Amino acid sequence: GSNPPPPETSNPNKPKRQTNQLQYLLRVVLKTLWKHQFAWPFQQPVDAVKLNLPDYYKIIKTPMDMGTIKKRLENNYYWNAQECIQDFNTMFTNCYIYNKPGDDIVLMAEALEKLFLQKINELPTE
Ligand SMILES: CNc1cc2onc(C)c2cc1NS(=O)(=O)c1cc(Br)ccc1OC
Numbered sequence: 262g263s264n265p266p267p268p269e270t271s272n273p274n275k276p277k278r279q280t281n282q283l284q285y286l287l288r289v290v291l292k293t294l295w296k297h298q299f300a301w302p303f304q305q306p307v308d309a310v311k312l313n314l315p316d317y318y319k320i321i322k323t324p325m326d327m328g329t330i331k332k333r334l335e336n337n338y339y340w341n342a343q344e345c346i347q348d349f350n351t352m353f354t355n356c357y358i359y360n361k362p363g364d365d366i367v368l369m370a371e372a373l374e375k376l377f378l379q380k381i382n383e384l385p386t387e
């Protein structure tokens with residue numbers, strides 16, 4: 262097992278901008294998920310070598326983590342909040358795909374996902 266390159270956090274070929282919604286996603290949504298007790302497995306790309314997970318990138322082809330999401334928001338990688346929201350969902354979904362119902366990591370992802378959904382219920386309109 263080697264690790265694949267991490268997801269891009271910059272791209273000259275990809276339209277990007279700042280929005281009010283994206284700023285909230287960084288300052289309020291991301292920051293509250295990042296500081297939760299259960300953030301730690303999701304703060305960086307999965308290191309399948311150091312975690313001894315040789316099948317991780319056999320199963321998961323569109324990997325995502327909050328480290329990547331944070332650097333994207335900070336770099337203004339996104340065109341809109343929906344793209345950023347989709348990266349969160351990919352993150353959660355990957356966890357639920359690779360693992361099983363009730364697994365410790367799954368229960369952590371579910372808890373972060375609940376909090377995420379709450380927080381983005383307060384997302385401004387443009
Ligand atoms: C079962 N190991 C893991 C599965 C994972 O799915 N998505 C991620 C991210 C992820 C990370 C691990 N490895 S781990 O962080 O050391 C880990 C976390 C938790 Br909660 C419980 C068990 C773990 O490793 C046995």
Ligand code: NA
Pocket residue numbers: 356357358359360361362
């Ligand atoms: Na699964």
